[model samples]
Target: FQGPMSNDVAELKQYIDDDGDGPRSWTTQWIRAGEEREQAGDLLAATTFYNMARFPFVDSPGRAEALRRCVAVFDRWRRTVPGIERLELRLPGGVVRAWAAGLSTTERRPVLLMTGGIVSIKEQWAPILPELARYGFAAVVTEMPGVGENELRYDLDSAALFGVLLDAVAERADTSRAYAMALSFSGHLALRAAPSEPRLRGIVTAGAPVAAFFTDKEWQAAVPRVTVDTLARLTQTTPATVFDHVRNWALTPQDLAGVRIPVAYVASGRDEIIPPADPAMLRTHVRDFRTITHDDVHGSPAHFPHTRLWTLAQVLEMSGADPRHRAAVDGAL
Candidate 1:
């Protein structure tokens, strides 16, 4: 609630107890509390506690433990929620682990595929899937290439992997209404793929970097050292080579011209990670593009709940979903 961590002072204090306040101890305590809450039939509590257990430790040595606990808690939480399924998609490079919710075998439904940036995994979608389902969408929550259980390497070409996923989803649901929402750095891939992927009804990007991320060396150097290292590892290159790799990944205006679907770009004015000039540059290349700006920081949680629903509504309406159902869903959310 507060950035990525818990805003509840009491819960925060609980994790800091036991005369130990390091990442390991904090995660251990939260995981223990999460399990207890799960057993007590307090799934919502368990989910929040487990998320807190992992959120702060994403880039730390305790990350593996945090991820393990977070995944387990999310799996358990899904048992209490309806219409969610765990999936393993075998693509060209390797298996991609994902969570699909709200698909109906008897009735075809619109599908929305969600992917996160470097630090987020498939488990991060658990909290949002139910709401997405209510909006008449079968949500497919996946990891970006090289993140979480996804085995594909991160690179410009990695965006093509989504075509395989689209094919798989088409076999199960309504491809005519298929859409995609990419968060943070994954937006670059979404933009790259939107041009060629005819099945996608629309695409939404939150705090995604565009040309500047690749062209500006100073901007790349300004990124957090931890994030740079992570990207380097995902791309299978040294830190010194990561910038060059990103430069090659830059999409040209010609590439943007090919994107025929309606696209929406959400940028945070205070986003330290992406330069304002990047999205400004994107506005020029995109033919049917919409832009939204918020005063919060990059990928602000404050804006996510509303922006997510708004994006889903736009995609659903554009794809010809029933207006009444969408209206009801909107009011409920």
Candidate 2:
């Protein structure tokens, strides 16, 4: 559960075991076998996987492998779902790739620009995107510079990445409305973009840390191997040195107050990573704000939270939507 593993690897090991040799484990079967059962309308089996996948454990390599495998299975399910189109747009300096799901025939669909974590690829969001598309809005799974197949080196600062996406969306003539969906580490980018981007119609951020300050500090103290390569490329410094730079550049209340668009803040009530205390700070900075909480653990990214896509569907529907697709979005919400 420590390095190069899905965020929930250790947690998944407690409920199901693939070998059938352990005390009823959740293991890799939850997302793998569980999704298949769910698609067949076997809610009982799906619930079994969900419950087991939440079991807490330490850094067991076996558990880690199972979790990653389950994630892969979820990814495949997302790809196979109906109403999704794969799009790859080349930005001036890099590529902007996304899985666009759902449709609205009335006009150009409102754009939901999902920002990625420092290490998250666009593909990692497979667990949620397709459902969003089905709800009648275009759901975009996007990446910033380093993580996806982009030309430039990664930049940890939030504003820089948001700027790029804003520029890309601005180039579209029919994009009447736009929203930024920020996740985990990408929250900083949302904070940076909402204030400056006139084209942005709304904002939604889940599992978003209040600041990059902590990530910087944690990286320095632990020198976690998972972040070494990213730090090297982004800051041209050891992972340790970049922490101070990240923390110093973090946004304050004044910075967040400038964001004029409607915003939705989401987090797991039991989240261990950012913790409950973090959202209080977010509340003060956000102008028009809404919060959705889930009963999941810390490592559980908002992308995988129970009913998260439902919340995003609601956000897309409220931000001045196409009347023709209103019914579909209403049904999903």
Candidate 3:
């Protein structure tokens, strides 16, 4: 809800009160800051500031342009990092895209398929790829289906996109040792695909909604209006009854039991979107499982730095990246 550039309480409150009114609308204000940052040649800052203007959703032409500008600025930042490639995968429906780091056809490395939540664009996750690349692991960042340029509809069946995305990277990396870091809403989709996709080496999920979030009335009642609206907008369903369509999307105990691959769930203890039992099942079912619950909300805002270390540490160990290389990169930073 808050813009990243400036967290001034009164100013942002005023921006919300303005609500796209005149020269001081929330979107206009952030857009101006983004332009200011870009003019100063801070592309990373500019990209994220522009992203705040496009945050939550891209439902209007102005917000849509913010996304276009955001992506363009992020592309400029990408060029500064080494061992990177911009990829466009042509699927039957439309062209999906990714920014891959440490990719090489000659030397195969384990792949990391990273995805963000319903409201998150891939650019938010793209900045971390350069660091992971230094660990001798190939990483590709893509937005959740129905988010950003990914043309696939967001639904249960769209879980196939996980495997599809990993398969598409086979030419540059080893798909057999592929792992998925599905954060927030994207976690449900990854769990759906994990059992069916035999090649998925491991999974890392944070604040993922499992079954009760969809079926439980109490939890559904607490869902944010914009979140429900976003789901309806993506699925073309009535917002008033969006939960009805998703009730069938829950993952049962058997789903986790059948997940032969190692899995990790970074549970948010106070996460309103997920029920407690979900992470409990994940811990008990998957034979090779590791979990660290943060006493925060769905985003784990309280322990931002610590969670990133734990989250990436699990991925590093599961990816089987060289320990010495990990130690070396630790010092390289």
Candidate 4:
């Protein structure tokens, strides 16, 4: 960890070996340095460093430990923040956890459920909750399967988690009108659930593989090894057959045609993980659909600010945030 500090994600990758073991490894080094910050009372630094220790996936035991430490330090960090609630949402599969904001025990506002890819943990979404709150929406942020505290596997039927999550959120907030901002791999889950989950009023997803990646064997084979292996582990299948395990996860034409609610898809022409045809499918069949395309790759890291504004603006419009504020956002670009 030296002055070679955090946030230099590409720079840090040079030190991470394929197996990510040893005292010199990414997990070991960051955990040591993260706890060094924790011991010195810089819980904010500790939280981010612990998350950096976990990096991409939590396959190894050291990475698993890193995730646990991340949750612990994040818990401590949340205590200092105002109006944040860590929720124990007990669904049929298990107790799914969330960090909620802007809920009044007596009054209900429109709700937004937010999640990220397989590698992104729930705590990473913490900073955005306040922004959502500012927009007059209550938010419940959580992780996908096999990441952080979420225990479910990412299978076809696992999309039902959103239905159950709505049930849980309904108890605490208004679900008669709810929305989602599910990014990356979790975007597929949001799309799969949209047609059937009656409570989900609208959604904003980015770079999701709704059908092509799951059904196209050649495309699956061409995917980066880290992604293939991670999905194989998360979906509980062998790398050779990971595509088959998630084949049912593909959104059928009927599923596409049935979505009556608004959907905003964020995409990239340079994204190899999600085929160019994916959002095209959405535009054709989904009646109330829009898309924002970035010229960058996969997650659109280069155009982050633009994507963030577009995402928030879509949520604002869909959730019926004040028109004046929404107009301000829409005009920013």
lDDT of 3: 0.79
* CA lDDT of every candidate: 0.73, 0.56, 0.79, 0.79
Candidate closer to the true structure by lDDT (higher is better), 1 or 3? 3
- Best-to-worst order by lDDT is 4, 3, 1, 2
TM-score of each: 0.83, 0.62, 0.91, 0.91
Clashes of each: 0, 8, 0, 0
Q: Cα RMSDs of all predictions?
A: 5.4, 7.3, 4.2, 4.6
Off by over 4 Å in 3: 1-18, 325-333
TM-score of 3: 0.91
| Count of clashing pairs, candidate 3 | 0
Q: Which ten residues in a row have the lowest lDDT in candidate 2?
A: 50-59
Looking at model 3, report the run of 10 residues with the lowest lDDT sum. 1-10
Clashing pairs in 3: none
Model 2: number of clashes?
8
Please, what are the lDDT tens digits per residue for candidate 2 over residues 231-301?
Answer: 44444454445565556555678877887877777777775456455677678777877887766664344
